[PDB]
Amino acid sequence: QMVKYFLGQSVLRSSWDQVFAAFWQRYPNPYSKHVLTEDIVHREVTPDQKLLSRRLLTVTNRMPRWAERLFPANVAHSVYVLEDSIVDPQNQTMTTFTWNINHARLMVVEERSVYSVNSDNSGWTEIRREAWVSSSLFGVSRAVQEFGLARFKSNVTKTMKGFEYILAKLQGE
């Protein structure tokens, strides 16, 4: 169906205090081999004491050997991803929203995560995520389909014209 939707729930075992501060110290680490740069490009503080922050970061592009073939356009370009973080300690919660800003053509993946203290354990921190994978390429295949029938509809009319015409040319030599 049009845009795919993902819902995931996880918890990692550490104080809400201790992860929010780890959130800015994760890079590098062995598993994030694919992340290349990371930058904090805006960061304000509200009147309700919340840390609004926008972090851009470039990631290597890794596609399956059929995709480069169909999209040579975007193989030697990496992915720029933006992350929007609001941090709330008064409530002990943090919500992030993340998504690519190039390769928009062929796909946009985008994630609203929420980080809060685990419900049944208070020394831990639950994490909710909802995903939306989409691709403008559906609209395209519609366009190619709509254009292709319209051409066919005119080209059927031409056949009748050309058919009626040459039928007339045969009657009485």
């Binding site: 800015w24 590098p28 904090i40 490009v41 926008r54 851009l56």
Partner: protein, 68 residues
């Protein structure tokens, strides 16, 4: 240890703002609001440098609405 940045000029530079911000973040932001931010005198220098490096790489950011 060093992560790098979009502007290679300001890689080590971030590493200074970074270590500042965590100490600030961890010591007196979760514990309670306490006083204001000391890293602003470094952060101002960092942001200008970064903005320059993105226009060099033509990175989109049409001031996009926060949270999309």
């Amino acid at each position: 240890d060093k992560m790098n940045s979009v502007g290679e000029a300001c890689t080590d530079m971030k590493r200074e703002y970074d270590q500042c911000f965590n100490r600030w973040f961890a010591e007196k932001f979760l514990k309670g609001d306490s006083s204001g931010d000391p890293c602003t005198d470094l952060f101002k220098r960092y942001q200008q440098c970064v903005q320059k490096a993105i226009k060099e790489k033509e990175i989109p950011i049409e001031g996009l609405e926060f949270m999309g």
